[PDB]
XYZ file of C-alpha atoms in Angstrom:
693
model
C 68.434 -14.073 -43.231
C 65.524 -14.016 -40.746
C 65.195 -11.277 -38.115
C 63.261 -11.141 -34.854
C 62.044 -7.886 -33.376
C 61.684 -9.113 -29.750
C 59.620 -8.060 -26.696
C 61.086 -5.451 -24.378
C 63.433 -6.362 -21.527
C 61.530 -6.353 -18.228
C 61.634 -3.198 -16.089
C 62.495 -2.638 -12.418
C 64.450 -5.869 -11.915
C 67.921 -5.536 -10.388
C 69.225 -8.392 -12.534
C 66.952 -9.787 -15.234
C 69.642 -9.838 -17.911
C 73.224 -11.061 -18.175
C 75.942 -12.063 -20.626
C 78.849 -14.503 -20.942
C 82.150 -14.208 -22.903
C 82.221 -15.023 -26.630
C 79.520 -14.462 -26.466
C 75.877 -14.521 -25.555
C 73.455 -11.994 -24.086
C 70.180 -12.985 -22.432
C 67.320 -10.803 -21.254
C 64.059 -11.474 -19.484
C 61.087 -10.177 -21.436
C 57.595 -10.973 -20.185
C 57.555 -14.717 -19.364
C 60.640 -15.662 -21.422
C 64.349 -14.985 -21.715
C 65.511 -13.994 -25.192
C 69.012 -14.852 -26.309
C 71.322 -12.682 -28.408
C 74.572 -13.931 -29.898
C 77.194 -11.202 -29.934
C 80.520 -11.136 -31.773
C 82.008 -13.250 -34.609
C 79.668 -16.116 -33.712
C 76.682 -14.047 -34.828
C 77.777 -14.615 -38.425
C 76.843 -11.181 -39.758
C 78.145 -9.454 -42.891
C 81.205 -7.151 -42.503
C 78.856 -4.150 -42.700
C 76.147 -5.020 -40.173
C 76.374 -4.981 -36.348
C 77.705 -8.351 -35.142
C 74.666 -9.577 -33.217
C 71.748 -11.912 -33.849
C 68.596 -12.641 -31.852
C 68.863 -16.433 -31.870
C 66.695 -18.079 -29.235
C 64.255 -18.088 -26.342
C 63.976 -19.827 -22.971
C 60.346 -20.913 -22.736
C 58.797 -22.459 -19.632
C 57.907 -19.841 -17.041
C 54.216 -18.964 -16.846
C 54.586 -15.526 -15.229
C 56.955 -12.522 -15.454
C 60.621 -13.440 -15.344
C 62.108 -11.253 -12.603
C 65.656 -12.565 -12.563
C 68.259 -13.906 -14.958
C 71.848 -14.924 -14.365
C 74.446 -16.856 -16.382
C 76.930 -19.257 -14.921
C 80.327 -17.618 -15.294
C 82.201 -20.861 -14.727
C 84.435 -21.964 -17.653
C 82.977 -24.835 -19.637
C 79.508 -24.019 -18.343
C 78.745 -20.600 -19.833
C 75.755 -22.389 -21.359
C 74.131 -22.750 -17.931
C 71.920 -20.000 -16.477
C 69.172 -19.450 -13.942
C 65.865 -17.592 -13.857
C 63.461 -16.435 -11.195
C 59.783 -15.759 -11.907
C 56.546 -14.545 -10.369
C 55.397 -18.132 -10.948
C 57.358 -18.936 -7.780
C 60.016 -21.081 -9.426
C 63.782 -20.790 -9.878
C 64.830 -22.639 -13.040
C 68.215 -23.871 -14.241
C 68.571 -23.769 -18.038
C 70.917 -25.125 -20.682
C 70.909 -22.511 -23.454
C 72.363 -25.066 -25.883
C 69.155 -27.096 -25.653
C 66.838 -24.290 -24.402
C 65.648 -26.806 -21.805
C 65.192 -26.721 -18.032
C 67.909 -28.768 -16.316
C 66.181 -28.684 -12.938
C 64.277 -26.211 -10.753
C 62.801 -25.460 -7.349
C 59.765 -23.761 -5.836
C 61.209 -23.177 -2.373
C 60.178 -19.513 -2.238
C 56.722 -18.741 -0.872
C 56.842 -15.036 -1.590
C 57.469 -13.066 -4.770
C 61.091 -13.533 -5.768
C 63.082 -10.345 -6.172
C 66.271 -11.529 -7.830
C 68.927 -14.214 -8.013
C 72.625 -14.575 -8.706
C 74.812 -17.443 -9.866
C 77.864 -17.707 -7.609
C 81.080 -16.563 -9.279
C 82.909 -18.961 -6.941
C 80.740 -22.053 -6.451
C 79.916 -23.928 -9.642
C 76.324 -24.943 -8.937
C 75.321 -22.346 -6.368
C 72.432 -20.036 -7.187
C 71.362 -17.578 -4.512
C 67.882 -16.096 -4.647
C 66.023 -13.625 -2.415
C 62.376 -12.632 -2.098
C 60.206 -9.719 -1.000
C 59.931 -11.008 2.597
C 63.684 -11.138 3.091
C 63.899 -14.892 2.622
C 67.067 -16.062 0.867
C 67.616 -19.481 -0.681
C 70.994 -21.019 -1.392
C 70.533 -23.565 -4.147
C 73.225 -26.062 -5.050
C 71.379 -27.356 -8.116
C 73.804 -30.083 -9.136
C 73.769 -31.995 -5.869
C 70.144 -31.420 -4.902
C 70.855 -29.347 -1.784
C 69.260 -26.138 -0.573
C 69.367 -23.898 2.475
C 66.959 -21.170 3.544
C 68.419 -18.067 5.161
C 66.622 -15.197 6.872
C 68.533 -12.049 7.617
C 66.252 -9.129 8.355
C 62.502 -8.659 7.771
C 62.856 -6.377 4.752
C 62.079 -6.454 1.043
C 65.101 -7.669 -0.928
C 65.784 -5.611 -4.060
C 69.154 -6.903 -5.163
C 71.867 -9.330 -4.185
C 75.362 -10.063 -5.427
C 77.591 -12.951 -4.389
C 81.214 -12.003 -3.804
C 83.532 -12.814 -6.717
C 86.317 -13.413 -4.190
C 84.841 -15.191 -1.177
C 82.546 -18.139 -1.867
C 80.601 -17.662 1.398
C 79.936 -13.931 1.233
C 76.800 -12.399 -0.282
C 75.774 -8.729 -0.327
C 72.055 -7.965 -0.141
C 70.380 -4.615 -0.808
C 66.913 -3.812 0.503
C 63.981 -1.591 -0.430
C 64.612 0.697 2.566
C 68.304 1.380 1.853
C 69.815 -1.236 4.158
C 72.824 -3.089 2.770
C 74.216 -6.199 4.422
C 77.077 -8.581 3.742
C 76.226 -12.048 5.043
C 78.179 -15.291 5.423
C 76.001 -18.060 4.026
C 78.184 -20.730 5.655
C 77.294 -19.205 9.029
C 73.496 -19.308 8.691
C 73.540 -15.899 6.997
C 75.231 -14.069 9.859
C 75.641 -10.377 9.071
C 79.361 -9.725 8.676
C 78.854 -6.083 7.751
C 75.846 -3.806 8.021
C 76.406 -0.898 5.660
C 74.371 2.107 6.769
C 74.110 5.216 4.623
C 71.531 4.925 1.871
C 68.111 6.572 2.358
C 66.210 4.720 -0.372
C 65.999 1.556 -2.519
C 69.199 -0.301 -3.351
C 69.193 -1.022 -7.080
C 72.607 -2.567 -7.605
C 75.560 -4.029 -5.767
C 78.917 -4.408 -7.489
C 82.049 -5.811 -5.832
C 85.475 -4.556 -6.846
C 86.722 -7.215 -9.308
C 90.162 -6.961 -7.732
C 90.670 -8.358 -4.208
C 92.288 -6.361 -1.403
C 92.024 -2.616 -0.865
C 95.088 -1.354 -2.733
C 93.707 0.104 -5.978
C 92.369 3.122 -4.072
C 89.895 -6.798 2.589
C 87.724 -5.689 -0.331
C 85.617 -2.919 -1.853
C 82.007 -2.889 -3.011
C 79.749 -0.268 -4.561
C 76.032 0.227 -4.064
C 73.701 2.227 -6.293
C 70.465 3.653 -4.951
C 67.279 5.534 -5.783
C 68.642 8.111 -3.319
C 70.890 9.237 -6.227
C 74.140 8.242 -4.558
C 76.668 5.553 -5.319
C 78.441 4.456 -2.150
C 81.813 2.691 -2.034
C 82.305 0.559 1.077
C 85.341 -1.013 2.768
C 85.094 -4.609 3.993
C 87.997 -3.825 6.340
C 86.423 -1.054 8.397
C 82.873 -2.104 7.484
C 82.166 1.520 6.575
C 81.746 3.817 3.584
C 84.832 5.344 1.995
C 83.321 7.323 -0.872
C 80.001 8.902 -1.792
C 79.307 9.764 -5.418
C 76.156 11.747 -6.110
C 74.675 11.662 -9.606
C 75.216 14.816 -11.682
C 72.136 16.599 -12.972
C 72.601 16.843 -16.729
C 70.530 18.504 -19.435
C 68.555 15.941 -21.439
C 70.321 14.956 -24.664
C 68.780 14.105 -28.018
C 65.513 12.286 -27.407
C 62.283 14.242 -27.473
C 60.638 12.180 -24.755
C 57.024 11.717 -23.654
C 56.759 13.958 -20.546
C 53.493 12.388 -19.386
C 54.898 8.963 -18.473
C 56.348 8.738 -14.954
C 60.024 7.862 -14.550
C 61.885 7.547 -11.263
C 65.642 6.973 -11.119
C 67.123 3.489 -11.454
C 70.776 3.487 -10.495
C 72.564 0.329 -11.611
C 76.301 -0.383 -11.649
C 79.029 -2.208 -13.490
C 82.558 -2.451 -12.078
C 84.818 -3.303 -15.060
C 87.433 -5.972 -14.290
C 89.810 -4.331 -16.787
C 89.603 -0.961 -15.068
C 89.543 -1.573 -11.279
C 89.735 2.185 -10.595
C 86.715 2.934 -12.775
C 83.005 2.400 -12.070
C 80.166 2.502 -14.597
C 76.696 3.593 -13.526
C 73.377 4.568 -15.014
C 72.026 8.066 -14.448
C 68.913 10.187 -14.933
C 67.381 9.861 -18.389
C 69.348 6.678 -18.988
C 72.684 8.377 -19.560
C 75.608 6.119 -18.680
C 78.614 7.379 -16.722
C 82.117 6.134 -16.125
C 83.302 7.280 -12.713
C 87.021 7.840 -12.106
C 87.500 6.564 -8.550
C 91.080 7.895 -8.360
C 89.658 11.390 -8.819
C 87.372 10.675 -5.857
C 87.686 14.104 -4.199
C 86.725 15.667 -7.535
C 83.850 13.319 -8.449
C 85.082 12.905 -12.013
C 82.787 11.159 -14.474
C 82.638 10.777 -18.232
C 79.428 10.525 -20.252
C 79.062 7.497 -22.521
C 78.965 8.688 -26.151
C 79.788 12.218 -25.005
C 81.047 13.275 -28.449
C 78.343 11.573 -30.514
C 74.681 12.576 -30.413
C 71.488 10.532 -30.659
C 73.152 7.428 -29.231
C 72.361 7.572 -25.508
C 69.281 5.976 -23.958
C 66.378 8.393 -23.390
C 64.871 6.749 -20.310
C 66.287 5.013 -17.240
C 68.637 2.061 -17.602
C 67.967 -1.045 -15.495
C 70.742 -3.545 -16.199
C 74.344 -3.379 -17.365
C 76.100 -6.608 -18.396
C 79.744 -7.066 -19.546
C 80.576 -9.234 -22.555
C 84.084 -9.830 -23.907
C 83.876 -11.196 -27.434
C 86.281 -13.806 -28.718
C 87.862 -11.071 -30.854
C 88.695 -9.207 -27.631
C 86.033 -6.497 -27.714
C 85.179 -5.268 -24.214
C 81.426 -4.763 -24.543
C 78.709 -3.632 -22.147
C 75.029 -4.221 -22.786
C 72.362 -1.930 -21.366
C 68.619 -2.484 -21.001
C 66.322 0.490 -20.638
C 62.797 1.738 -20.085
C 63.110 3.260 -23.574
C 62.827 -0.311 -24.971
C 66.224 -0.208 -26.663
C 68.966 -2.682 -25.889
C 72.297 -0.960 -26.468
C 75.764 -2.402 -26.819
C 78.641 -0.207 -25.679
C 82.372 -0.477 -26.364
C 83.903 0.107 -22.943
C 87.268 1.022 -24.493
C 85.727 3.965 -26.376
C 82.442 4.578 -24.497
C 80.701 4.595 -27.883
C 77.457 2.827 -28.738
C 78.312 -0.040 -31.097
C 74.698 -0.871 -31.922
C 71.086 -0.749 -30.791
C 68.445 -3.482 -30.733
C 64.858 -2.155 -30.535
C 62.055 -4.053 -28.806
C 58.257 -4.093 -28.553
C 56.209 -3.470 -25.415
C 52.856 -4.717 -26.706
C 51.081 -6.711 -29.433
C 52.201 -6.123 -33.006
C 48.711 -5.249 -34.261
C 49.471 -3.878 -37.704
C 52.068 -3.845 -40.480
C 52.189 -1.543 -43.512
C 54.784 -1.121 -46.260
C 55.048 2.258 -47.983
C 54.484 2.207 -51.749
C 56.631 5.325 -51.968
C 59.698 4.450 -49.836
C 60.015 0.774 -50.683
C 60.809 -1.261 -47.587
C 59.671 1.400 -45.129
C 57.674 -0.780 -42.726
C 55.318 0.841 -40.235
C 54.434 -1.255 -37.186
C 51.419 -0.605 -34.965
C 52.178 -1.635 -31.397
C 50.260 -2.045 -28.134
C 52.751 0.139 -26.274
C 51.452 3.317 -27.876
C 54.343 3.929 -30.256
C 54.442 3.614 -34.009
C 57.651 2.028 -35.282
C 58.977 2.692 -38.761
C 61.463 0.026 -39.814
C 63.759 0.871 -42.708
C 63.890 -2.797 -43.652
C 66.215 -2.198 -46.597
C 68.895 -0.420 -44.584
C 72.217 -1.794 -45.786
C 74.274 -1.213 -42.623
C 71.620 -1.828 -39.944
C 69.306 -4.849 -39.614
C 67.137 -2.954 -37.127
C 66.963 0.589 -38.454
C 63.843 1.505 -36.514
C 62.530 4.908 -35.546
C 59.894 5.533 -32.868
C 56.948 7.903 -33.132
C 55.032 8.548 -29.916
C 53.536 12.035 -30.301
C 49.740 12.154 -30.337
C 49.484 8.376 -30.236
C 49.430 7.231 -26.576
C 47.119 4.213 -26.855
C 47.410 0.972 -28.828
C 47.984 1.406 -32.572
C 45.640 -1.148 -34.101
C 45.603 0.153 -37.684
C 48.085 1.680 -40.139
C 48.119 2.805 -43.750
C 50.744 4.790 -45.678
C 49.496 7.431 -48.091
C 49.709 5.984 -51.645
C 51.864 8.814 -53.038
C 52.788 11.324 -50.349
C 56.141 10.369 -48.780
C 56.224 9.974 -45.005
C 52.474 10.429 -44.657
C 51.179 7.716 -42.353
C 47.587 7.190 -41.273
C 47.171 5.439 -37.942
C 44.274 4.270 -35.806
C 44.106 3.323 -32.134
C 42.232 1.029 -29.752
C 40.305 3.999 -28.347
C 38.931 4.870 -31.797
C 41.344 7.672 -32.665
C 42.290 8.327 -36.301
C 45.477 10.249 -37.031
C 47.821 11.432 -39.778
C 51.518 11.305 -38.978
C 54.107 13.098 -41.079
C 57.139 10.947 -40.289
C 59.379 13.222 -42.379
C 58.847 15.906 -39.732
C 58.963 16.203 -35.956
C 55.512 17.767 -35.765
C 52.796 16.023 -33.745
C 50.239 14.127 -35.848
C 46.972 15.654 -36.972
C 44.058 13.984 -35.209
C 40.618 13.519 -36.737
C 38.016 15.359 -34.669
C 35.693 12.423 -35.275
C 36.443 9.334 -33.168
C 35.168 5.791 -33.597
C 33.201 4.464 -30.645
C 35.483 1.436 -30.661
C 38.850 0.132 -31.915
C 40.023 1.256 -35.353
C 40.339 -2.049 -37.244
C 41.370 -0.784 -40.660
C 42.494 2.317 -42.526
C 42.408 2.666 -46.297
C 42.960 5.424 -48.822
C 40.522 5.824 -51.671
C 38.721 8.343 -53.885
C 36.452 10.768 -52.033
C 32.713 10.061 -52.252
C 29.751 12.346 -51.479
C 29.421 14.574 -49.700
C 33.205 15.147 -49.596
C 33.725 14.695 -53.351
C 31.176 17.481 -53.923
C 33.003 20.630 -52.800
C 35.244 22.285 -55.393
C 38.739 21.923 -56.862
C 40.936 23.180 -54.016
C 38.499 22.137 -51.290
C 39.275 18.406 -51.409
C 42.390 16.247 -51.979
C 42.898 13.418 -54.455
C 42.248 10.777 -51.786
C 40.016 10.415 -48.757
C 41.048 8.484 -45.647
C 38.636 5.659 -44.776
C 38.465 4.202 -41.271
C 36.519 1.259 -39.891
C 35.745 0.948 -36.191
C 34.738 -2.011 -34.048
C 31.287 -0.478 -33.629
C 30.826 -1.030 -37.370
C 30.931 2.468 -38.847
C 33.108 3.329 -41.817
C 34.110 7.000 -41.777
C 35.386 9.120 -44.637
C 38.006 11.623 -43.420
C 39.296 14.654 -45.311
C 43.126 14.815 -45.023
C 42.938 18.594 -45.595
C 40.198 19.095 -42.993
C 40.920 16.567 -40.233
C 39.523 19.127 -37.786
C 36.206 19.056 -39.622
C 33.669 16.258 -39.401
C 34.234 12.874 -40.990
C 31.338 11.283 -42.854
C 29.465 8.086 -42.046
C 29.398 6.531 -45.522
C 26.318 4.500 -44.551
C 24.193 7.545 -45.342
C 25.498 7.484 -48.917
C 25.230 3.708 -49.245
C 21.605 3.932 -48.057
C 20.688 6.809 -50.407
C 22.363 5.384 -53.508
C 20.859 1.921 -53.098
C 17.466 2.911 -51.668
C 18.017 0.721 -48.627
C 15.244 0.685 -46.022
C 16.491 -1.743 -43.378
C 19.449 -1.112 -41.051
C 22.858 -1.368 -42.705
C 25.255 -4.169 -41.702
C 27.916 -3.681 -39.055
C 31.073 -3.101 -41.129
C 34.253 -4.827 -39.919
C 36.616 -4.446 -42.863
C 37.192 -2.135 -45.807
C 39.383 -2.728 -48.837
C 39.623 -0.616 -51.983
C 40.457 -2.336 -55.267
C 43.855 -1.221 -56.604
C 42.235 0.726 -59.473
C 40.317 2.852 -56.965
C 37.039 2.101 -58.705
C 35.731 -0.581 -56.346
C 35.337 -0.636 -52.558
C 34.705 -3.843 -50.627
C 33.150 -3.879 -47.186
C 33.456 -6.881 -44.902
C 30.676 -7.237 -42.335
C 29.959 -8.759 -38.933
C 27.496 -11.248 -40.480
C 30.208 -12.594 -42.791
C 28.915 -10.881 -45.910
C 31.209 -8.936 -48.220
C 29.647 -6.129 -50.246
C 31.060 -4.682 -53.465
C 30.484 -0.981 -54.222
C 31.490 1.120 -57.225
C 32.411 4.774 -57.625
C 31.182 7.454 -57.635
C 28.242 6.964 -55.262
C 28.940 3.520 -53.802
C 26.360 1.698 -55.874
C 26.107 -1.879 -54.631
C 26.862 -4.304 -57.461
C 27.610 -7.508 -55.579
C 27.029 -9.230 -52.252
C 29.294 -12.176 -51.458
C 27.825 -14.560 -48.905
C 30.528 -17.077 -48.083
C 31.926 -16.479 -44.603
C 29.542 -17.328 -41.773
C 31.381 -15.183 -39.223
C 32.735 -11.628 -38.898
C 35.093 -10.638 -41.747
C 38.523 -9.588 -40.467
C 40.546 -9.073 -43.604
C 40.063 -8.440 -47.318
C 42.827 -8.082 -49.908
C 42.650 -7.376 -53.632
C 45.270 -8.930 -55.904
C 47.751 -6.475 -57.455
C 47.594 -5.226 -61.061
C 51.154 -5.950 -62.198
C 50.791 -9.713 -62.554
C 51.166 -11.698 -65.769
C 47.452 -11.967 -66.516
C 45.204 -8.878 -66.346
C 42.207 -10.683 -64.832
C 44.176 -11.400 -61.639
C 43.445 -7.865 -60.422
C 39.830 -9.006 -59.998
C 40.838 -11.605 -57.399
C 39.745 -10.861 -53.849
C 40.914 -12.905 -50.849
C 39.110 -12.751 -47.514
C 39.459 -14.094 -43.978
C 36.903 -14.262 -41.157
C 36.642 -15.638 -37.622
C 36.295 -19.068 -39.212
C 39.538 -20.758 -40.257
C 38.729 -21.227 -43.936
C 39.906 -18.602 -46.421
C 38.033 -17.753 -49.612
C 39.045 -16.174 -52.881
C 36.458 -14.655 -55.189
C 36.820 -13.592 -58.816
C 34.873 -10.389 -59.406
C 35.737 -9.938 -63.088
C 32.363 -10.963 -64.470
C 30.198 -9.017 -62.020
C 32.286 -5.827 -62.131
C 32.586 -5.725 -65.919
C 28.857 -6.406 -66.318
C 28.085 -3.342 -64.164
C 24.669 -4.715 -63.090
C 21.828 -2.271 -62.393
C 20.582 -4.583 -59.659
C 23.144 -6.206 -57.302
C 24.256 -9.812 -57.825
C 24.673 -12.314 -54.985
C 27.628 -14.710 -55.061
C 27.444 -17.846 -52.924
C 30.267 -19.924 -54.383
C 33.988 -19.311 -53.935
C 36.443 -18.999 -56.803
C 39.006 -20.708 -54.554
C 38.936 -22.291 -51.094
C 42.008 -22.314 -48.843
C 41.630 -24.763 -45.960
C 44.283 -25.610 -43.400
C 44.258 -23.096 -40.558
C 42.607 -24.155 -37.309
C 41.635 -20.786 -35.865
C 40.476 -17.358 -37.048
C 42.175 -15.445 -39.868
C 43.391 -11.961 -38.916
C 45.176 -10.919 -42.087
C 45.671 -11.982 -45.703
C 48.040 -10.481 -48.271
C 48.899 -11.182 -51.909
C 52.535 -11.442 -53.000
C 53.522 -8.548 -55.283
C 56.102 -10.884 -56.874
C 53.780 -13.697 -57.926
C 50.496 -14.523 -59.601
C 47.885 -15.644 -57.091
C 50.187 -16.322 -54.140
C 48.621 -15.522 -50.756
C 49.946 -15.365 -47.220
C 47.568 -15.629 -44.258
C 47.978 -14.898 -40.531
C 45.989 -16.889 -37.978
C 45.107 -17.197 -34.322
C 46.384 -20.775 -34.650
C 49.829 -19.221 -34.220
C 51.077 -19.714 -37.759
C 51.327 -17.882 -41.057
C 50.485 -19.861 -44.189
C 51.702 -19.216 -47.739
C 49.380 -20.458 -50.463
C 49.298 -20.901 -54.203
C 45.713 -19.650 -54.289
C 45.117 -20.586 -57.915
C 45.782 -24.266 -57.209
C 44.458 -24.239 -53.634
C 47.895 -25.452 -52.582
C 49.529 -24.777 -49.200
C 53.225 -24.082 -49.774
C 54.761 -23.337 -46.386
C 53.843 -22.692 -42.769
C 55.763 -20.302 -40.509
C 55.679 -21.394 -36.890
C 58.189 -19.024 -35.284
C 55.591 -17.022 -33.352
C 54.592 -18.116 -29.853
C 51.361 -16.148 -30.040
C 48.341 -15.434 -32.183
C 49.276 -13.620 -35.403
C 47.592 -10.268 -36.019
C 49.186 -9.061 -39.237
C 51.375 -10.118 -42.121
C 53.014 -8.323 -45.041
C 55.137 -9.463 -47.977
C 58.539 -7.882 -48.496
C 58.225 -5.414 -51.391
C 61.657 -6.317 -52.745
C 62.377 -9.896 -51.710
C 59.958 -12.517 -53.091
C 61.134 -14.939 -50.414
C 60.697 -12.627 -47.451
C 57.587 -12.033 -45.335
C 56.970 -10.052 -42.129
C 54.456 -11.034 -39.425
C 53.385 -9.653 -36.043
C 51.629 -11.404 -33.166
C 50.401 -10.939 -29.607
C 53.677 -12.493 -28.488
C 55.084 -8.942 -28.726
C 57.208 -9.988 -31.728
C 57.647 -9.122 -35.349
C 59.336 -11.853 -37.372
C 61.082 -11.349 -40.646
C 61.176 -14.816 -42.208
C 61.956 -16.581 -45.472
C 59.459 -18.875 -47.205
C 62.442 -20.897 -48.463
C 63.418 -21.808 -44.889
C 60.005 -23.194 -43.928
C 59.983 -27.001 -44.030
C 56.334 -27.430 -43.017
C 53.847 -27.055 -45.867
C 50.628 -26.507 -43.902
C 49.382 -25.519 -40.437
C 49.443 -28.094 -37.601
C 46.312 -30.249 -37.842
């Protein structure tokens, strides 16, 4: 079964996610809304969490700021979005298509809400205080203007079809009657700061403690208001609690977001977010005592570690009372309201998926290099969890553009960043990574482990390790780092290449490095398209391959455990041109020439992509089967030996940056793109044989 690791839910939106019974969860992420089936309908094995990332609403061209489902029976498939592109769209999630839309707002839209009472009424509000009532299914609209203030949130009454509560940036809360030109029925004064959430009591009247409503605010209070007296009746101030579990990045700024959910099943209870993203259930009967209970109070490592923005109820068709939370910590969590325990967690990505690397030691341990400054390690072979992902943020900070697991040492992960930093992370510990004192001037493109070469290999038994760490930067230098002396200086291997080969002219700008599996041969890809072949111990040049006419992005040597031994001499390469080449280096390497040979003809040619090639990788399960990632938005699987395209994966909505074959499943491949997604997909499910032409 395929899996999508999606982009992160958008931050600082009062309602940019929602859910309907059954059921289905939707969240705004960048310019899309991603859909998550929850419950029996997800069709998961008895052992795995019952959810599946199933779809996407594509159409908006800017940040989606608002998302709301219809909660009218028979039309739980309808929903509405707001966006910085100035439009409010009505969607059918069954078809993932826009039903209709408007662009009535002139100012940045803050939020919107589908009326609980009127079937086709969507109410939206913008940063100038302008409100639009939108009856989408009869082509009617009405502008309303209440007070000249920045709208932060709004919630239509679940009881009275005309009443809407609006919360503003300056703490003002109003209840308006939209049938009376937006006349303020109640002005609720009390809050000192931003209103983040308005929840009405799901039960009419004022008996359980007219109507009640609760407002959550940056001012750290939740206020309960009476529609009868038009005044507050209860003030709950957030408790200050010691941080649980997560060792969080102190540097990043994080103000409070106080959002609410008033459970229909428990009219006397109120759920809110809190500092650090803890969730609370408030007992409103114990008002005078301010009684709350922590979500997952008895279990550790389950709470969010940063502020929570949205809470959305979902009753599954097998009667589970669920609550979904979105957070700044980039986890989506599903809570069982009956137990206050976290049922499952869905991780997300806040930047490009630049790099993928499978450990050769812990099979299925997949490291992901992400533009949000966190390394992910995905235990892809976890039996009980489809998204067993751990985050590593220490010492990283910037965009992780390169990864490589140590070939033998468990948990040892080399990483490289967009600001030229090279690091060694021990993921089996909670220590910060070791950072190489030597930085690249530009982005770290590639990391690779290989035998040390001079001068590092010339130092004594216990002075140097079995393997050196090689790094290639966008400026074109390849550095040799000592894992045991990362604080020392790393070596520009150009000096050795020049000395060994008596080179007089300037060396090429290196853009890729790939060691042959036997550790005897190092390939360098270069900005001029050339690929150079060097042999141990002193990087003697034995071959120059002149085939690509543009910068080489990716080089991959075929594995050694195939059926035929010669296959380990096969080298695939991709450049900024769309055509992929394979070269067979058996003859040149085994001849060990004293003067370097130039190759100008490919062993194989793989044509089909229509934009640059970012990554190629050989299947460890096959002979001569290659997968390629491309800026044309697809990944292509090839039978390289027959120059035959087999299947084309088109699930990404961006340019692919990396691809890696599953170590255990011959059918399964992982790819990452600048659409902030990693896709796990099956070659057997791909009906298209080649890229779009």
